Amino acid sequence: PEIRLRHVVSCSSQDSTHCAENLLKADTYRKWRAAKAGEKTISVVLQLEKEEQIHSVDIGNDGSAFVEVLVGSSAGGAGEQDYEVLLVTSSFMSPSESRSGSNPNRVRMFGPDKLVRAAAEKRWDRVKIVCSQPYSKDSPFGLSFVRFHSPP
Structure with a gap:
């Protein structure tokens, strides 16, 4: 079930039109992008409605070269050293593509086997998404969408 x-x-950074709020539902066809071109990495923490176990993660890219997903809890606050990695840094774009802007919109699905299972074993209510683009400072980058799913 979709979380x-x-x-x-x-x-960490967002556009006036392509703002973080756009990621709360994949339904929208609305994007999240950096306020500015040339930020090497950008970040958002999303709050789940309830604490849940994550089974799968779909990522719709939008100009990023790498994407990382970490998981955390709103309970007892949430520090830097507080987020567990759920999906290790995954590639969506090559240096060449990143430089030329080719294939910025690649969508990739990550099932239970491609997530780290120590983190994937537990329940969370916070979700941190980190996007990087070290190969090109020419454009704002981000995500098109993100879908989390609980176990069936």
């Missing part, structure tokens, strides 16, 4: 996202807890 429901309540609100955006924090965002």
Whole structure:
């Protein structure tokens, strides 16, 4: 079942139109992008409506070369050293593509086997997504969408 996202807890950088809020539902066809070109990495923390176990993760790219997903809890606050990695840094774009802007919109699905199972074993209510683009400072980058699913 698709996990429901309540609100955006924090965002390192976002556009006035392509803002973090756009990721709360994949339904929208709305994107999240950096306020500016040339930020090597950008970040958002999303709050789930309830604490849940994550089974699968779909990522719709939008100009990023790498994407990482970490999981955390709103309970007892949430520190830097507080987020567990759920999906290790995954590639969506090559240096060449990143430089030329080719295939920025690649969508990739990550099932239970491609997630780290220590983190994937537990329940969470916070979700941190980190996007990187070290190969090109020419354009704003981010995600098109993100879908989390609980176990069936």
